[PDB]
Amino acid sequence: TKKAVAVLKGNSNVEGVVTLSQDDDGPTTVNVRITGLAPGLHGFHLHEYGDTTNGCMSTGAHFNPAGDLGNIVANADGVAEVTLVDNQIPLTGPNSVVGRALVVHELEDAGGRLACGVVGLTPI
Amino acid sequence: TKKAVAVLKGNSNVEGVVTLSQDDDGPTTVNVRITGLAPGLHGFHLHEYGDTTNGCMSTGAHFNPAGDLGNIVANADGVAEVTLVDNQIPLTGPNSVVGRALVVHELEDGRLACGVVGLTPI
Ligand SMILES: [Cu+2]
Ligand SMILES: [Cu+2]
Known about the structure:
The structure is a homodimer. The first copy, chain A, is an all-beta fold. Chain A has strands at 2-8, 15-22, 28-35, 40-47, 68-74, 80-86, 101-105, 113-118, 120-121.
């Protein structure tokens, strides 16, 4: 019933697409495909602000109304392809993440900020 | 009381920053600074989708629940610096433009640049 997207870019080689989907006030399906990563674990987080004026730094802190989405795993080719299901990522209501940022880190679970993107509406 | 931002980029040299500000359900102050424009008039619009996966084209059509914000004027240096006040740009409600796109055009009234409308601190 509701879809969002985030195009990930940053001060590095790391780039990707994340799609989020949600039926009503239910759980949220997150499709992560991110390339150019150092093989291994990487912190994947929801930051508070869709602000990209000072790179990934203007996105602020973790979105806690936490916004830690876990680690994602980059294979030997530096590709992290995974599907998450989280319950704390509303696309609706007071706590909508629409208009905030997704950030991928250099380290696991925080690390430097390789790439981010604003969470924008995509068609259903 | 509420602030948003859009960083504009695209398949060209055109880039910029737009900040929007709103008190309650009032009128919305839009600060446009965009560089690298062809001197003259340029269409400045609100598109439906914060989707940048296919450059500015995935942002879709005008945001009509129109989303025409007018023309902006680029000087001899290709800089369009202006402050608009529009009433049809809510940062709140069913019609929030938070998560959509701002798009600047090659003509007045192609897509030179765009940016998703994200939350900035107040
Ligand atoms: Cu983070
Ligand atoms: Cu347009």
